[PDB]
Design a protein around this ligand. Structure first.
Ligand SMILES: Cc1cccc(S(=O)(=O)NC(=O)Nc2snc(C)c2Br)c1
Ligand SMILES: Cc1cccc(S(=O)(=O)NC(=O)Nc2snc(C)c2Br)c1
Ligand SMILES: Cc1cccc(S(=O)(=O)NC(=O)Nc2snc(C)c2Br)c1
Ligand SMILES: Cc1cccc(S(=O)(=O)NC(=O)Nc2snc(C)c2Br)c1
Lengths: 317, 317, 317, 327
């Protein structure tokens, strides 16, 4: 039987017998994602070029406005906003959403794959909503995932029930379930990091990458891929296995990616798919944040690959 | 004034006072590309998943059928076909087209950017049309370019008048001219290659990459990007500058990329944009092919970057 | 605040605290309507004409399969099927749906507006479901409405809470609420019927029409409009007010339109909008059917217009 | 072989060995029609209703559709470099194309015919007629005051259940279906010809009290045939492109005649009656004012009205016989 995101989410909600807010939140996100995809694909660009005589801001406004209007949220943290957005009282719901509305958009001028990343928390206290309501470890996530605006648009949704992938059919604006309960390979054959900055690598990163290129045994070197857009590189890691790294070094001891709306949602997707996501020192999902925009190092992907990285990491510790 | 691919090509044709065949060929190609884009973005995928109860083959069929019916072609070489396709007598025109209908599609399962690459030649010999009509050096190209199905769909068309970039507006199915007479940066800050083959690199490649990561003048290291899809990596190279390399290795001693419908069209785009494209020993466009599917090593991109590589290549003889 | 069909329906469901089946049914219908719209607008028609080398059947299959897979239905009556379809046990829910999947499609060759009409009933008994479960008076309707595939695509949904109109935004495949709690004009200025059957008209219809052309109170004559596609004619009646007639004639002594999936849903939409719908002798919604394909005469629209017709009808005893 | 509007037009141009301006004009129009279709189908309407907040709505998105359609047609024709004088239903005076963008063609068009009732989602359309400028004077409004006989090409786009462009030239009438998945007009019916006689009549009968006596009698013959044949069916959408296109595909007769209150009719000669009359005649149909062929009226005002009776030749001839009987 054909299954849509709308039907899938609603059936998960019925089985859980929640209040319906999470379902409304997910419907609003899906609508925002379809609108981002339409704009990312440049629908209407002819009008901008005068046929009748910003993209990351627009994407943020789409997510912000759809989530506010869901009546399911009270605190919104975006990569685009200095401060957490507090939802107005008459529209408050119980969920906190941290999101990057258009990840990788810095390089969108080369038409590289871009994406939207989101993580959904339940507000824990009855206090007046504030930025602190988003300062939860990723292990508290109720749902997380991403939309990839690649060759096609796909939404990957991770919940307690596992990871499910939905392909956007743009002819009808429906996300069609195409991969159920996905699991990552135990061990992959691709490593993914920006090797242009090798001179700044932590010595452990240098050694691990060297083992991928010059294996000490008789196995094949790993292939290298680095899109530079986190959603694309993570999704490839999910689909094909392997390891993705944006690690710490001396110049950047906390990494560069952002914990709340990049590392944690991806870490959650990975673990729900049977993968791993570490800072090197702890699981990403166990970091307790103190700042809504704080950075975290992230090494994620197939468990055997991440464990091997941790073995080398400890060797230099 | 807004300008479309249709209007642009027709206006180039009027000025040249040709017979109109090249214009009809390009109109057909544009139509095929819009049809490829729609299928790549998964329009109609819900019917495949049962709402009412292969992508590279379809792409090949679209290009083949649109080109045959243009009455402008006589010999068609596709990555998808072992032998050259000879157009039936009643539809034959004067042009030979070499194309990759859906480049990068091996990894389309992770929704990586894919593309269509094409090169157009005038049939040179007066013999009955045959596979040999496609065995022309790239310097004989009349027109070449590619469509990138990335975050948006863009057609890059290079002719004697230069390189022009058209964004597909999917709301109206029109390619809108958005970048005229494009020129690549003289020198970039990104290098692009699969570093997993580091164990197989010739010393010149190894040294060049080492200069990008550890510059001897103590300037900033280059960033690294490698999508693994040639159209995406070359388009980023064109738009941001820098260098793209696919040299020979032990699996691919004559290189990996195909001369006829990957290297030559990209080399032609590069040169018309003020860039360079070399095998290491000669310019790609000067290689005389003997086999329609033969491979070639390629180093292309910003001229200062390729020239620096060639100095290293010469230092190692 | 922007509102979607999905969000709107789910909020009505949350307030009523039902089992969720009606919501899942309405989501499935909405999906079917978007797919019918895409096909009606001829998306993909180029593939039918050989670019790479039935509409009412497809519409019926789309509605049938989406309703079956909703797990919300047990009995399905379609204009396209001689007998009621009994949903197999593992997919059964409590609702009976009567629908015309592509109304007006006989003239779709002139690209006349077409539409989808539906009426939803709750099955009352614990008996095994059967065709007789659809033999309910319109008064028992739980929900009804139509999709109009006109210059744009619009879904009109009537429930106990009133009538709401949603515009399909094809850029994102979303139904946007554009008119809330719709009410028809008390009196219109347009009458709508096929006057080619004037030779067969009941004297009451003949006199009523003569009053529209030669008003007895010295007002302006009514304009005439008759698309010949019921959904288009009824929707204009809803939007501008006025009256729509399909009375009996010699070919159709019980009228021509079908009671279960044309007259009753339109009668229900009209009444929830403050209009009227009569056979001449009784309210459409009060007719108790004995056959799922039985026909009924129908006069509907603004209350003052319908009352005026009824006064003429009673004058003719 | 599959055929597109672009390929088809270019092939007619190659055979004629013209300058290519007419082909560029038709390409520009085709682009404008695709944009009108997208807007008419309400692409992007969610932004008007606040999906991105009360900030991200653009200038073109707020414009009413008939203004936007006029802007699309105007700008695409100007930029074709093929036109010198443009007449639109929306503009009191003719637009004279600026000198550096001038070509030899005069275009009269109705950018969004029927849009007054677009609020009920009625079929709407774009109507166009193309003339070659005849005089050596500087281009001016007078260049559009040509009889329909002088038309080089005409036709319409219908935004109905699907979008179709009907294009009439000397080679006849061809119908192209817009495939919105790829934005291509696909040729679906070649060299179209109307039925000799139909079974549908189309006019606003609500205004029967004002009918010309000949119209009253003709309509009475359609509803109460004297030879005991079947009465005609009636259809009246109220949108000319829809009613005329149905007439072309199914046959029959469409009337917007004169009366004492409107002795010259209601529809506009330059950009409604003449293009529709040209299409009808190229399809083997007829189009009359009652007194003469529509295409023979020589206009004196770009917005002058004309009565029109068109459709299957047998039907129009029967109408004219009744009209002559009433002298
Ligand atoms: C995706 C998801 C998972 C778990 C919980 C939720 S929820 O809290 O939103 N609850 C619901 O949706 N309940 C619903 S849905 N239909 C009914 C009849 C009910 Br009771 C959503
Ligand atoms: C893109 C391009 C460049 C050079 C040559 C060509 S061509 O060989 O196709 N010739 C033409 O198009 N001639 C045309 S087009 N309109 C007219 C009136 C003429 Br004469 C195409
Ligand atoms: C449109 C409509 C109106 C009335 C009744 C229905 S229903 O019978 O389908 N019930 C529900 O939807 N219950 C729902 S929805 N979310 C929750 C948490 C619950 Br409890 C649907
Ligand atoms: C549709 C139409 C019909 C007749 C005349 C025209 S035209 O005047 O625009 N001329 C052309 O198109 N010439 C063209 S097109 N390609 C070539 C090589 C040439 Br020569 C257009």
């Amino acid at each position: 039987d054909v299954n849509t995101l709308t039907r899938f989410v609603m059936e998960e909600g019925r089985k859980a017998r929640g209040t319906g807010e999470l379902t409304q939140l997910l419907n609003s996100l899906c609508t925002a994602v379809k609108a981002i995809s339409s704009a990312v694909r440049k629908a209407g660009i002819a009008h901008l070029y005068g046929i009748a005589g910003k993209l990351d801001v627009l994407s943020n406004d789409l997510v912000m406005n759809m989530l506010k209007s869901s009546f399911a949220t009270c605190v919104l943290v975006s990569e685009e906003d200095k401060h957490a957005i507090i939802v107005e009282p008459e529209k408050r719901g119980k969920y906190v959403v941290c999101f990057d509305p258009l990840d990788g958009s810095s390089n969108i001028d080369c038409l590289v794959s871009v994406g939207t990343i989101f993580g959904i928390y339940r507000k824990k206290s009855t206090d007046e909503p504030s930025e602190k309501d988003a300062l939860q470890p990723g292990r508290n996530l109720v749902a997380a995932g991403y939309a990839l605006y690649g060759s096609a648009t796909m939404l990957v949704l991770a919940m307690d029930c596992g990871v499910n992938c939905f392909m956007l059919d743009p002819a009808i604006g429906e996300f069609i379930l195409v991969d159920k309960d996905v699991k990552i390979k135990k061990k992959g054959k691709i490593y993914s990091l920006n090797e242009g900055y090798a001179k700044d690598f932590d010595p452990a990163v240098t050694e691990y990458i060297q083992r991928k290129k010059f294996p000490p045994d008789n196995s094949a070197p790993y292939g290298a891929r680095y899109v530079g857009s986190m959603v694309a590189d993570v999704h490839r890691t999910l689909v094909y296995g392997g390891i993705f790294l944006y690690p710490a070094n001396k110049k950047s001891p906390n990494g560069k990616l952002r914990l709340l709306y990049e590392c944690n949602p991806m870490a959650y997707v990975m673990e729900k798919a049977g993968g791993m996501a570490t800072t090197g020192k702890e699981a990403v999902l166990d970091v307790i944040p103190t700042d809504i925009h704080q950075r975290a190092p992230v090494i994620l992907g197939s468990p055997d690959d991440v464990l091997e990285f941790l073995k080398v990491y400890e060797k230099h510790s």
